[PDB]
Amino acid sequence: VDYIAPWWVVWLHSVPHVGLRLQPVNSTFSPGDESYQESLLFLGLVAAVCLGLNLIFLVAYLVCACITWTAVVAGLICCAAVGVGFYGNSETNDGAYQLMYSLDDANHTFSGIDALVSGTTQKMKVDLEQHLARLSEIFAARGDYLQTLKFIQQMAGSVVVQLSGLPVWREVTMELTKLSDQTGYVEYYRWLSYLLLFILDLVICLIACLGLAKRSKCLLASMLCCGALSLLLSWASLAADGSAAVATSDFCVAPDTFILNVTEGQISTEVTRYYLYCSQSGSSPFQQTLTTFQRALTTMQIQVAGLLQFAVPLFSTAEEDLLAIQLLLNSSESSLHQLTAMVDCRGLHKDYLDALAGICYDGLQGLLYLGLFSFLAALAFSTMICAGPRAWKH
Amino acid sequence: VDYIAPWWVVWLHSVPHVGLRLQPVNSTFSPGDESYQESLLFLGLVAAVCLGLNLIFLVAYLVCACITWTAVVAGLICCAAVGVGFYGNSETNDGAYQLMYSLDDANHTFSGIDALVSGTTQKMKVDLEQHLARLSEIFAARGDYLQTLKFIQQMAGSVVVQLSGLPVWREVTMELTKLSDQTGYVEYYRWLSYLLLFILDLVICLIACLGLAKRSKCLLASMLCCGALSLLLSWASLAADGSAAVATSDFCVAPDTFILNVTEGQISTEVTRYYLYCSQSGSSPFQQTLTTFQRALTTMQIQVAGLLQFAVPLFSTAEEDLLAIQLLLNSSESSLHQLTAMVDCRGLHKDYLDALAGICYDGLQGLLYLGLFSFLAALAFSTMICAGPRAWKH
Ligand SMILES: *[C@@H]1O[C@H](CO)[C@@H](O[C@@H]2O[C@H](CO)[C@@H](O)[C@H](O)[C@H]2NC(C)=O)[C@H](O)[C@H]1NC(C)=O
Ligand SMILES: *[C@@H]1O[C@H](CO)[C@@H](O[C@@H]2O[C@H](CO)[C@@H](O)[C@H](O)[C@H]2NC(C)=O)[C@H](O)[C@H]1NC(C)=O
Numbered sequence: 007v008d009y010i011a012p013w014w015v016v017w018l019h020s021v022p023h024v025g026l027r028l029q030p031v032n033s034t035f036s037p038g039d040e041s042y043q044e045s046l047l048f049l050g051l052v053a054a055v056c057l058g059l060n061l062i063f064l065v066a067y068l069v070c071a072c073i074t075w076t077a078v079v080a081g082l083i084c085c086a087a088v089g090v091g092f093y094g095n096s097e098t099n100d101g102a103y104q105l106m107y108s109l110d111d112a113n114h115t116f117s118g119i120d121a122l123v124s125g126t127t128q129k130m131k132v133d134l135e136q137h138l139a140r141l142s143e144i145f146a147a148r149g150d151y152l153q154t155l156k157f158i159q160q161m162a163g164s165v166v167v168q169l170s171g172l173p174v175w176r177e178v179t180m181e182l183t184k185l186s187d188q189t190g191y192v193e194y195y196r197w198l199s200y201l202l203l204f205i206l207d208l209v210i211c212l213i214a215c216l217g218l219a220k221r222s223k224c225l226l227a228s229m230l231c232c233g234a235l236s237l238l239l240s241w242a243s244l245a246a247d248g249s250a251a252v253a254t255s256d257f258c259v260a261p262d263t264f265i266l267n268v269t270e271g272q273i274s275t276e277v278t279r280y281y282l283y284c285s286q287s288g289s290s291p292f293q294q295t296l297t298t299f300q301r302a303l304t305t306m307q308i309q310v311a312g313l314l315q316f317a318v319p320l321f322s323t324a325e326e327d328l329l330a331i332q333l334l335l336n337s338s339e340s341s342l343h344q345l346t347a348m349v350d351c352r353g354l355h356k357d358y359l360d361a362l363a364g365i366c367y368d369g370l371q372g373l374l375y376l377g378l379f380s381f382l383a384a385l386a387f388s389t390m391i392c393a394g395p396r397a398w399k400h
Numbered sequence: 401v402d403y404i405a406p407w408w409v410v411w412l413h414s415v416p417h418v419g420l421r422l423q424p425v426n427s428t429f430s431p432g433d434e435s436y437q438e439s440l441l442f443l444g445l446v447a448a449v450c451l452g453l454n455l456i457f458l459v460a461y462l463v464c465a466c467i468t469w470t471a472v473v474a475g476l477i478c479c480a481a482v483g484v485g486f487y488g489n490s491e492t493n494d495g496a497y498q499l500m501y502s503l504d505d506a507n508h509t510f511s512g513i514d515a516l517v518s519g520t521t522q523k524m525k526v527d528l529e530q531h532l533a534r535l536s537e538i539f540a541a542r543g544d545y546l547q548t549l550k551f552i553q554q555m556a557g558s559v560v561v562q563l564s565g566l567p568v569w570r571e572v573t574m575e576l577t578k579l580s581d582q583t584g585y586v587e588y589y590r591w592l593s594y595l596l597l598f599i600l601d602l603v604i605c606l607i608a609c610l611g612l613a614k615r616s617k618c619l620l621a622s623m624l625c626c627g628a629l630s631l632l633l634s635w636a637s638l639a640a641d642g643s644a645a646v647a648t649s650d651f652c653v654a655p656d657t658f659i660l661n662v663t664e665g666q667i668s669t670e671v672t673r674y675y676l677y678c679s680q681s682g683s684s685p686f687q688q689t690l691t692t693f694q695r696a697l698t699t700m701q702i703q704v705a706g707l708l709q710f711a712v713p714l715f716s717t718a719e720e721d722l723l724a725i726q727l728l729l730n731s732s733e734s735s736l737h738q739l740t741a742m743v744d745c746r747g748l749h750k751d752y753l754d755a756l757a758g759i760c761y762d763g764l765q766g767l768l769y770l771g772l773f774s775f776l777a778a779l780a781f782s783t784m785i786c787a788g789p790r791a792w793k794h
C-alpha cells in the first residue's frame with residue numbers, strides 16, 4: 007500500500023487563500039502562522055456574508071408580497087438533506103475513530119520500545135553488576151575466569167552504550183496521548199452537536215407537515231422562528247465545514263512535509279523519514295545498533311556457557327547465580343527480538359497510512375457531505391420560507 | 401487491545417438450534433456439518449412461515465371488508481426503515497471491508513516472510529557456492545584459509561537447514577487470497593442488492609404518495625402489486641439476515657477454537673497459538689532458529705573480516721569476491737532483521753483482532769440493523785395494505 011493524493015484533496019488545495027485583507031498567502035499547511043488563521047477565517051466570512059445575502063433575499067420575498075407542490079418539494083429536500091447529513095456525520099466519526107486508533111497503536115508501539123530499552127538497560131546494569139559482585143569473591147582465588155568477568159562487564163557497558171543510542175520516545179508519547187484526548191473531546195462534542203441538529207431538523211419537518219395538517223396559525227410562527235434559527239445554524243455549519251475541509255485537504259497535500267517540519271527537534275530527521283517512508287531496500291538507522299547488541303549478547307552467552315561447562319565442576323559452591331545470568335541473557339535476547347520487531351518501519355508506517363486514510367479519505371468525504379447537508383438544508387428552508395406568504399393564506 | 405465477547409454475540413449464541421426435525425443440534429460453528437447447515441435453514445423457514453402467517457393476515461383484512469393518519473404513519477415508518485437500512489448496509493460494508501483489509505495485510509505479511517526465506521536460502525546456497533568455487537583455486541596454495549572456506553560452507557549449510565525449518569506459507573496465501581476474492585464478490589453483490597431494495601422502497605413510497613395525490617385508481621393496483629413483491633422480498637431479507645447473524649455469532653463466540661481446528665494440518669499448532677494469542681511472556685517458537693541464524697551470520701562475517709584483514713594484504717589476487725561476500729552477508733543480516741520483524745505475533749495478532757472487530761462488532765451490528773429494516777418495512781407495508789380497503793374508497 008502507498009499514499010497518493012485523491013482528486014478531492016488536490017482540487018480543494020487549489021482554493022485560493024487571501025486572508026482578511028485579500029492578499030495572496032503561503033498555501034502550505036502551517037497552523038500558528040497568523041496569516042493562515044486569517045485565510046481560514048476568510049472562508050468562514052464568505053459563508054457568513056452568503057448568509058446575509060440569503061437572509062435579505064428571503065425577507066424581501068416576504069415583503070414583495072401549486073403551493074402544496076412547493077411544500078412537498080421542500081419536505082423531500084429536507085429529508086434527503088438530513089439523510090445525507092446522517093451519512094456524512096457517520097463517515098466523519100469513522101475517520102476520527104480511525105485517527106484515534108492509529109494514534110493509540112503508535113503510542114503503544116513507542117511505549118513498548120521505550121519500556122524494552124529501559125528494562126534491558128536497567129537489568130543489564132543492576133542485576134548483572136549484583137551477580138558479578140556476588141560471584142567475584144568465589145572466583146577471587148583464580149585469576150582466569152576473573153579476567154573473563156571483567157571482559158563480560160566491559161562488553162555489558164558496551165551494550166548499555168549502544169542501547170542508549172536509541173532515541174527516547176518519552177516526549178512523543180505525551181504528545182500523542184494528549185492529542186488523542188483532545189481529538190476525543192472534540193469529536194464527541196461535534197458528533198453530539200450534529201446529531202442534535204439532525205434531530206431538530208426532523209422535528210421541524212414534522213411540525214411543518216403538521217402546520218398544513220391542522221391549519222393552526224399559532225404553530226406557523228413557532229415553525230418560522232425555529233426555521234430561521236436552524237437556517238442561521240446551518241449556514242454557520244456550512245462555514246465551519248468549508249474551513250475544516252480546506253484545512254484538512256491542505257494538510258493532506260503534504261503530510262510528509264508537515265510531519266517532517268513539526269517533529270524536527272524532538273525526533274531526528276533520519277528515523278523520521280525511515281518511519282514515514284519505510285524503504286524496502288533497507289538502510290534502517292537501527293541496523294548497526296541491533297547488530298552490535300546481538301553480537302554482544304551471543305558472545306556473552308558463549309562465555310557464560312564456557313563458565314558453565316568448565317568452572318562449575320571446579321567452583322560448584324555458588325553456580326546457581328550463573329544460571330540466573332543465563333536466565334537474564336535469554337530474557338534479554340527475547341527482548342532483543344521484541345525490540346527489533348517493534349522498531350521496524352512496517353507497523354508504524356501502516357499506522358500512519360491508516361491515519362491518513364482516516365482523515366484524508368473518510369474524514370474529508372464526510373466533511374464534504376456535511377457541507378452538502380448544510381447547503382441543501384439552507385436551500386430547503388429558504389424555499390419553505392418564501393413559500394410561506396402564500397402558505398398561510400388558508 | 402484484546403478480544404472480549406460483546407453482549408449481542410453471547411445473546412445470539414443462545415438462539416435454539418434444532419434443525420429440520422426439531423432435534424437439539426450442537427451450537428458450535430461448523431459450516432461443514434450437514435446438521436448445522438439445516439439449523440441455519442430452519443431459521444430461514446421460521447421467517448418463511450412468518451411470511452405465510454403475515455400474508456394470510458393482510459389478505460383476510462382485505463376480505464373481511466383517520467385513514468390519512470394511518471397512511472402518514474405508514475410513510476413515516478417507511479422513511480425511518482429505509483434510513484436504518486442505509487445505516488445498516490453501510491455498517492455491514494464497513495465490516496466486510498475491514499475483514500478484506502485484515503486478510504490482505506496478513507497475506508502481504510505471509511508473502512513477505514516466504515519471499516525473505518526463499519531469497520535468503522537461494523542466495524546463501526547458490527551465490528556462496530559460486531563465489532567459494534571461484535576463489536578456491538586462488539587459495540589452493542595454502543591449506544589454511546581453505547579450512548576457513550570449509551567452515552564457512554558448513555555454517556552456510558547450517559543456516560539453510562535452520563531456515564528450512566521455518567513454516568511454508570504457500571497454501572495459506574492461496575486460502576487467504578481466494579477467500580478475499582470470494583468475500584469481495586459476495587459483498588459487492590449483497591451491497592448492490594440492498595441498495596436496489598432501498599431505492600425501490602423509496603420509489604414505492606413516492607408512488608404511494610402520488611396515488612393519493614392524483615386520485616388515480618390504475619396506480620393503486622401497481623403500488624399494491626409492487627408492495628406485495630417488496631413485502632415478500634423483505635421477509636426473505638429478514639430470513640437471510642437472521643440466519644447470517646446466528647452464524648456470525650456462533651463463529652464469534654469461539655474464533656480461536658474455529659481457527660485452531662480449521663488450520664490444523666497445514667500449520668503446526670504451536671505457531672497458530674502463538675499468532676492467535678501473542679503472549680509477551682511465552683517464548684516465540686522462532687526464537688531459537690532466529691538465534692541460530694544470527695549467530696551463524698555473525699561468525700561468518702567474523703571469518704570474512706579476518707580474511708580481508710590477512711588474505712587480502714598477502715594474496716591480493718581477487719578481493720571483489722570477498723567484497724561481494726560482504727555485500728551478500730550485510731544484505732542477509734538486513735533480511736534477518738526484516739524476517740524477525742515480520743514473524744512477530746504483534747502484526748498478525750493486530751490483523752486478527754481487526755478482522756474480529758470487523759465481523760463481530762461492525763458486521764453483526766449491521767446485520768441486526770438490516771434485520772430491523774426488514775421487520776419495520778414488513779410492518780409498514782402490511783399496515784399500508786390493510787389500510788388500502790378504506791384508502792381506495794375515494
Ligand atoms: C499512551 O502510552 C502511555 C505509555 O507510555 C500510557 O501511559 C500509561 O497510562 C496508564 C493508564 O492511564 C497508566 O497506568 C500508566 O502509568 C501510564 N504510563 C506512563 C509511563 O505514563 C498512556 O495511557 C497511553 N495513552 C493512550 C491514549 O493510549
Ligand atoms: C537459555 O537458552 C538456551 C537455548 O535454548 C538453553 O540452552 C540449552 O540448549 C540445549 C540445546 O539447544 C537444550 O537442552 C535447551 O534448549 C537448553 N537447555 C535447557 C535446560 O533448556 C539454556 O539452558 C537456557 N538457559 C537456562 C538457564 O536454561
Ligand SMILES: *[C@@H]1O[C@H](CO)[C@@H](O[C@@H]2O[C@H](CO)[C@@H](O)[C@H](O)[C@H]2NC(C)=O)[C@H](O)[C@H]1NC(C)=O
Nearest residue numbers: 503504505507508510511512573576577580581
Ligand atoms: C496475496 O499474496 C500473493 C503473494 O504470495 C499475491 O500473489 C501475487 O500477485 C501479484 C499481483 O498480480 C502477481 O504478480 C504475483 O505473481 C503473485 N504471486 C504468486 C506467488 O501468485 C496475491 O495477489 C495477494 N492477494 C491479495 C488479495 O493481496
Ligand SMILES: *[C@@H]1O[C@H](CO)[C@@H](O[C@@H]2O[C@H](CO)[C@@H](O)[C@H](O)[C@H]2NC(C)=O)[C@H](O)[C@H]1NC(C)=O
Nearest residue numbers: 294297701722723724725726727728729730731
Ligand atoms: C558491511 O557492513 C559493515 C558494517 O557497517 C561494514 O564494515 C565497516 O564498518 C566500519 C565501522 O562500523 C565502517 O567503516 C563502515 O560501517 C563499514 N565500512 C564501509 C566501507 O562501509 C562493511 O564494509 C560492509 N560491507 C561492505 C562490502 O562494505
Ligand SMILES: *[C@@H]1O[C@H](CO)[C@@H](O)[C@H](O)[C@H]1NC(C)=O
Nearest residue numbers: 023030031032033034035036
Ligand atoms: C511557501 O513558502 C515556501 C518556502 O518559502 C515555498 O517553497 C513555497 O513555494 C511557498 N508556497 C506558496 C503557495 O507560496
Ligand SMILES: *[C@@H]1O[C@H](CO)[C@@H](O)[C@H](O)[C@H]1NC(C)=O
Nearest residue numbers: 034036262263264266267268
Ligand atoms: C516547515 O516550516 C518552516 C516554517 O516556515 C519552513 O521554513 C520549512 O521549510 C518547512 N519544512 C519544509 C520541509 O518545507
Ligand SMILES: *[C@@H]1O[C@H](CO)[C@@H](O)[C@H](O)[C@H]1NC(C)=O
Nearest residue numbers: 413417424425426427428429
Ligand atoms: C458440541 O460438542 C462439543 C464436543 O463434543 C462439546 O464440548 C460442546 O459442549 C457441544 N456444544 C453444545 C452446544 O452442545
Ligand SMILES: *[C@@H]1O[C@H](CO)[C@@H](O)[C@H](O)[C@H]1NC(C)=O
Nearest residue numbers: 430656657658659660661662
Ligand atoms: C474441531 O472440530 C472437531 C470435530 O468436531 C472437534 O473434535 C474439536 O474439538 C474442534 N476443535 C476444538 C479446538 O475444540
